[PDB]
Amino acid sequence: TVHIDLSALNPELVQAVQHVVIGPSSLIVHFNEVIGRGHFGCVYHGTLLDNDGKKIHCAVKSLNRITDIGEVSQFLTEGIIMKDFSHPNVLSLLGICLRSEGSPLVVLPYMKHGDLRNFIRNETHNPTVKDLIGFGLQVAKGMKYLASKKFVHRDLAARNCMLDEKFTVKVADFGLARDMYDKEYYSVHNKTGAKLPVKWMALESLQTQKFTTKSDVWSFGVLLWELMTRGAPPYPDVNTFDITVYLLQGRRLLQPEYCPDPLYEVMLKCWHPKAEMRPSFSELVSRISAIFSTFIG
Amino acid sequence: TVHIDLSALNPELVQAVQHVVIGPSSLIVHFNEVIGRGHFGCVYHGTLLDNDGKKIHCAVKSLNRITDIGEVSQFLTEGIIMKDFSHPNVLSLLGICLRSEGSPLVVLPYMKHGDLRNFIRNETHNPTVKDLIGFGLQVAKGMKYLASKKFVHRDLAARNCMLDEKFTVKVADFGLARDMYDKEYYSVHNKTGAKLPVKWMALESLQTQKFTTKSDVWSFGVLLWELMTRGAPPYPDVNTFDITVYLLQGRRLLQPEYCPDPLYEVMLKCWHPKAEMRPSFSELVSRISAIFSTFIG
Numbered sequence: 231t232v233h234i235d236l237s238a239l240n241p242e243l244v245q246a247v248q249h250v251v252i253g254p255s256s257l258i259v260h261f262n263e264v265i266g267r268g269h270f271g272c273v274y275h276g277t278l279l280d281n282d283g284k285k286i287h288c289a290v291k292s293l294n295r296i297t298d299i300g301e302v303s304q305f306l307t308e309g310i311i312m313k314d315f316s317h318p319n320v321l322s323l324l325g326i327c328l329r330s331e332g333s334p335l336v337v338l339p340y341m342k343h344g345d346l347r348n349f350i351r352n353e354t355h356n357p358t359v360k361d362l363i364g365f366g367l368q369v370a371k372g373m374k375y376l377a378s379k380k381f382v383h384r385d386l387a388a389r390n391c392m393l394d395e396k397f398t399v400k401v402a403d404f405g406l407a408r409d410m411y412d413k414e415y416y417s418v419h420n421k422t423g424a425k426l427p428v429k430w431m432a433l434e435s436l437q438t439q440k441f442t443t444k445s446d447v448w449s450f451g452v453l454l455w456e457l458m459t460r461g462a463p464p465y466p467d468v469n470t471f472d473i474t475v476y477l478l479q480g481r482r483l484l485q486p487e488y489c490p491d492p493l494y495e496v497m498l499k500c501w502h503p504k505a506e507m508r509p510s511f512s513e514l515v516s517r518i519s520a521i522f523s524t525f526i527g
Numbered sequence: 528t529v530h531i532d533l534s535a536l537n538p539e540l541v542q543a544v545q546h547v548v549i550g551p552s553s554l555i556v557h558f559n560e561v562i563g564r565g566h567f568g569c570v571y572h573g574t575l576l577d578n579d580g581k582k583i584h585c586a587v588k589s590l591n592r593i594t595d596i597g598e599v600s601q602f603l604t605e606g607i608i609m610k611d612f613s614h615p616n617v618l619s620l621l622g623i624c625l626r627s628e629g630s631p632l633v634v635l636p637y638m639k640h641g642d643l644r645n646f647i648r649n650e651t652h653n654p655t656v657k658d659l660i661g662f663g664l665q666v667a668k669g670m671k672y673l674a675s676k677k678f679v680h681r682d683l684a685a686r687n688c689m690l691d692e693k694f695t696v697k698v699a700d701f702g703l704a705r706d707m708y709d710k711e712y713y714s715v716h717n718k719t720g721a722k723l724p725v726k727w728m729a730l731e732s733l734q735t736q737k738f739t740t741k742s743d744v745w746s747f748g749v750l751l752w753e754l755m756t757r758g759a760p761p762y763p764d765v766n767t768f769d770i771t772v773y774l775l776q777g778r779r780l781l782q783p784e785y786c787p788d789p790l791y792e793v794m795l796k797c798w799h800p801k802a803e804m805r806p807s808f809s810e811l812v813s814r815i816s817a818i819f820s821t822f823i824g
């Protein structure tokens with residue numbers, strides 16, 4: 231039971247939400263089929279009805295246990311941010327349900343193969359080295375696009391990239407994760423306080439808490455490493471409190487077994503201690519494209 | 528076009544600069560908006576970004592026309608000297624940009640009301656006698672602090688005190704000045720040779736070119752006089768070449784119109800021909816505090 235005063239929301243926000251509102255008899259939420267639980271609420275399988283009558287399989291993200299109007303606001307703006315991107319390697323929005331009674335909803339296209347991290351860890355799938363380089367390239371393209379819209383991601387990692395039925399990677403800001411044998415996704419970050427994924431963070435972000443596109447580039451480097459190790463945890467035998475010093479000493483993730491030398495060289499350029507010396511996403515797309523092009527497998 | 532060998536700088540200096548480094552990701556230099564031109568280079572309006580997102584209005588001091596590595600060194604040490612002071616009446620440092628390619632930068636907080644001399648001369652502002660005594664007191668407090676760190680200023684005068692949006696005086700070593708109708712600051716001292724502001728200098732400094740805290744006390748006396756006359760030039764009818772003799776004869780700046788007797792008495796004690804007989808800044812803070820406290824206006 232939720233009653234929301236719509237008049238207490240920013241009116242421009244409400245108007246933006248109206249441009250992507252979902253029809254009254256188009257969405258079915260399968261409460262029986264949970265995808266995950268977060269601090270915000272639940273994510274369900276759902277079935278949206280096309281402007282024609284067609285049945286679209288989607289993921290319904292629902293806001294539950296609401297305590298204040300600011301929480302509704304943030305939920306809705308996150309939704310609106312992703313409405314104004316349009317790129318095959320960035321996860322798109324199907325719609326939003328905002329009513330004065332009941333949980334607000336954000337509806338997303340269903341991603342057949344879930345998150346990229348569980349996919350590359352899954353032993354039934356045998357993604358080849360070339361494939362993994364392919365996935366890293368599609369990610370670079372998504373970040374290249376987002377960096378062109380001056381959007382800073384802050385939480386790039388394999389767990390936040392989804393993978394669709396055509397094996398297209400959609401960069402996303404899911405915030406949830408799951409284990410190999412878990413049926414359901416759960417929250418990665420704490421309910422309150424800053425989102426700090428230490429082992430994906432740039433040296434300067436660890437020190438100053440300031441995130442930039444150039445720090446997304448670092449996280450990408452780490453994301454590449456995940457791909458080439460098929461989802462190994464980074465710096466496993468290092469405590470999250472010692473990471474900073476470890477980096478300051480000049481140590482870096484080591485070359486994974488079947489990772490090509492020039493791709494590992496890309497990862498290092500991503501981890502350059504000076505941000506402005508790291509490559510842009512545009513340069514990464516070109517470098518990794520060249521590598522992919524000349525790779526045999 | 529300038530390229531600097533960082534390895535040719537003292538390594539401790541470079542390490543100190545690292546503790547206050549700014550990212551080329553955070554500073555915007557408005558080359559279109561010049562504040563002043565000196566022999567070192569230019570000062571621009573600029574916009575620095577807070578460690579997460581806030582836009583800070585600053586002044587960017589840039590080193591241009593560099594001929595040798597010693598010049599870079601001095602520029603940078605001046606910056607570092609002012610990083611290790613911390614006092615509300617001493618101008619602080621926002622940061623330094625030191626890169627191999629391009630002009631080195633020192634970034635400072637923007638002072639809404641510019642230098643103290645132009646402020647008290649400005650007829651749109653009607654600072655009362657009490658206010659002016661207030662400004663002199665804030666200066667004494669700044670010098671008191673600097674004298675406790677064994678720092679000798681050498682060039683204290685109203686033109687080198689800045690004034691912020693709360694009307695706090697920041698003692699500084701700006702080195703620049705401007706006229707009532709000039710839109711832009713210019714150099715006070717010659718390109719080459721010693722910085723010698725004759726009408727603010729202690730008798731012994733005029734003779735021996737040695738500067739001490741006790742000679743800063745003299746300059747302060749003169750600075751007080753500027754304040755009480757709302758920025759009149761000192762010894763106007765005296766040539767800079769005859770000042771020494773004039774002082775040797777025992778003559779001193781006269782009592783300004785609405786200056787209180789006991790504050791003028793403070794100024795004289797500052798101009799005592801024997802340095803060790805002048806008051807310390809700590810004594811000046813007490814004396815002027817008492818005067819300010821019992822002043823009605």
Ligand SMILES: Cn1cc(-c2cc(Oc3cc(F)c(NC(=O)C4(C(=O)Nc5ccc(F)cc5)CC4)cc3F)ccn2)cn1
Nearest residue numbers: 273289291308309312338339340341342344401402403404
């Ligand atoms: C088999 N399987 C299918 C699934 C499955 C699970 C799904 O759940 C979600 C996935 C998300 F990515 C978000 N994301 C979000 O809610 C937001 C988001 O994506 N932000 C954002 C996006 C792109 C940007 F560039 C920048 C920001 C608004 C935060 C939510 C979800 F519920 C969805 C589809 N499919 C899981 N397993």
Ligand SMILES: Cn1cc(-c2cc(Oc3cc(F)c(NC(=O)C4(C(=O)Nc5ccc(F)cc5)CC4)cc3F)ccn2)cn1
Nearest residue numbers: 570586588605609635636637638639640641698699700701
């Ligand atoms: C409206 N308006 C605002 C403005 C305006 C102009 C500004 O220009 C500057 C002011 C300075 F004081 C320095 N100072 C310096 O560069 C140094 C300095 O201050 N050293 C120092 C400082 C304090 C000490 F106790 C001892 C030494 C290193 C020499 C530089 C500047 F570019 C800045 C802000 N605001 C001018 N008009």
